[PDB]
């Protein structure tokens, strides 16, 4: 059977927290007043929610309202508990209130309003300095939630809100997030295809916070190389082949051999043999202003097959890539 795995950091955060901290099924929601919020316009719809801009008529301030779609009360209470546990943490979206929507018959989560700059306008404009600055801001959120025993499991551009005017960033949509318990097997059907870590794509269930660091590396690669998404697979099998054409097949076999994983035999006709590539091959005249030796070394240390070998969030914040970023 598969070789077990543990996070190399924050391994026992939840074992030493009180049970109420991670036992989200027993959480008792404290409901606010549903008429406090006047919906203004629909911002978006996803598979699990619809999001609206609203006015909190009690303090005359803008908020956003996330009306959850019908899903098992455990995933709803899981998200609520995680948001309450993380509230006040650096660059974590702030849950302001929870109300019962009378039409959907589900909870509506009320969040702080972030004046989000257009995500397409954003990445086409980000300077080298901006990319380093916002990556550091994302790392603050990830180190915080990891230090709190939680993995996000859905890091991707759509879940990073940036108000570029005020240089303000928030990590949102904690609906896939989970508590990390050593030895626990987790669902591999998490994250968007282009950001799925190798552990998900080879069906290795005993993963940890380091999943988020692969996803972060995929975002970084897309930003500094101006290729969206970077690993552009047609399905979850082709996604791993795309990764293997860059990281190479010998290190993929080393990875699965370390954990006693076998590839789906359907890979026999599609995977091939591939050398590991050097990151410089992706540099060209239209992205070179975003690339530096430090950027490539940082990216290289995030994008490892072996989840145990990736930089942790705190280690990433120590990387020379961020030396140029002005610290508060
Ligand atoms: C989907 O899950 C979440 C979403 C949000 C927030 C937004 C969304 N979508 C949002 O504020 N979008 C905006 N677009 N323009 C402006 Br101006 S604000 C907050 C917490 C969540 O868990």
Residue 171 near ligand 1, beta carbon < 6 Å: no
Same domain, 54 and 176: no
Q: What is the largest CA-CA distance in the chain?
A: 62
Residue 115 Cα, ligand 1 centroid: separation in angstroms? 9
Same domain, 95 and 13: no
Nearest to 110 by CA among 22, 48, 34, 43: 34
Same domain, 17 and 121: yes
- State how beta strands 168-171 and 160-163 pair: antiparallel
**Per the structure block, which two tokens stand in for 107?**
């909870």
Same domain, 98 and 190: no
The C-alpha atoms of residue 180 and residue 13 are separated, in whole angstroms, by 8
Start-to-end Cα distance in the chain: 48
* Domain edge (last residue) among 113, 130, 153: 113
Nearest to 213 by CA among 130, 303, 285: 303
Residue 134 Cα, ligand 1 centroid: separation in angstroms? 18
**Residue 265: half-sphere exposure toward Cβ, Cα within 13 Å:** 0
Same domain, 80 and 152: no
Same domain, 233 and 157: yes
Using omega within 30 degrees of 0 as the cis cutoff, is the peptide bond preceding 208 cis? no
CATH number, domain at 16?
1.10.510.10
Cβ–Cβ under 8 Å, residues 184 and 5: no
Range of the domain at 77: 23-113
* Domain edge (last residue) among 89, 113, 137: 113
Same domain, 200 and 320: yes
Residue 64 near ligand 1, beta carbon < 6 Å: yes
Residue 64 Cα, ligand 1 centroid: separation in angstroms? 6
List Cβ<8 Å contacts ≥24 apart for 18-27.
21/85, 21/149, 22/81, 22/149, 22/179, 22/181, 24/74, 24/77, 24/78, 24/80, 24/81, 24/82, 24/179, 25/74, 25/77, 27/77, 27/80, 27/81
CATH number, domain at 47?
3.30.200.20
Phi/psi class of residue 165: alpha, beta or left (left: φ > 0; alpha: ψ in -120 to 50)? alpha
Residue 93 near ligand 1, beta carbon < 6 Å: yes
Q: Residue 2 burial (CB < 10 Å; 0-12/13-18/19+)?
A: middle
Cβ–Cβ under 8 Å, residues 52 and 64: yes
Nearest to 80 by CA among 53, 108, 44: 108
Same domain, 107 and 125: no
* Domain edge (last residue) among 52, 82, 113: 113
Same domain, 151 and 83: no
Tell the residue nearest (CA) to atom 5 of ligand 1.
172
Same domain, 75 and 108: yes
Number of independent structural domains in the chain: 2
Experimental method: X-ray
Same domain, 34 and 131: no
Same domain, 168 and 102: no
Binding residues for ATP: 43-51, 66
């Amino acid at each position: 059977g598969p070789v077990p795995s543990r996070a190399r950091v924050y391994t026992d955060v939840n074992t030493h927290r009180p049970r109420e901290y991670w036992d989200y099924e027993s959480h008792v929601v404290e409901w606010g007043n549903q008429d406090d919020y006047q919906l203004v316009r629909k911002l978006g719809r996803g598979k699990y929610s619809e999001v609206f801009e609203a006015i909190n008529i009690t303090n005359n301030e803008k908020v956003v309202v996330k009306i959850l779609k019908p899903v098992k009360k455990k995933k709803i209470k899981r998200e609520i508990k995680i948001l309450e546990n993380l509230r006040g943490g650096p660059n974590i979206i702030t849950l302001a209130d929870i109300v019962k929507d009378p039409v959907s018959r589900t909870p509506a989560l009320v969040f702080e309003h972030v004046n989000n700059t257009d995500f397409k306008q954003l990445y086409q404009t980000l300077t080298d300095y901006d990319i380093r600055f916002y990556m550091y801001e994302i790392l603050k959120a990830l180190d915080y939630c990891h230090s709190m025993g939680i993995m996000h499991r859905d890091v991707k551009p759509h879940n990073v809100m940036i108000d570029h005017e005020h240089r303000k960033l928030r990590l949102i949509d904690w609906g896939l997030a989970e508590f990390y318990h050593p030895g626990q097997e987790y669902n591999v059907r998490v994250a968007s295809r282009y950001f799925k870590g190798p552990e998900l794509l080879v069906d290795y269930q005993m993963y940890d916070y380091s999943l988020d660091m692969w996803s972060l590396g995929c975002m970084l690669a897309s930003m500094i190389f101006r290729k969206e998404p970077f690993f552009h697979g047609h399905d979850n099998y082709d996604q791993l082949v795309r990764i293997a054409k860059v990281l190479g097949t010998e290190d993929l076999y080393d990875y699965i051999d370390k954990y006693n994983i076998e590839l789906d035999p359907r890979f026999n006709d599609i995977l091939g043999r591939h050398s590991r590539k050097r990151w410089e091959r992706f540099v060209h005249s239209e992205n070179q202003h975003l690339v530096s030796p430090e950027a490539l070394d940082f990216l290289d240390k995030l994008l490892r097959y072996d989840h145990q070998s990736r930089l942790t969030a705190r280690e990433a914040m120590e990387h020379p890539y961020f030396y140029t970023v002005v610290k508060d």
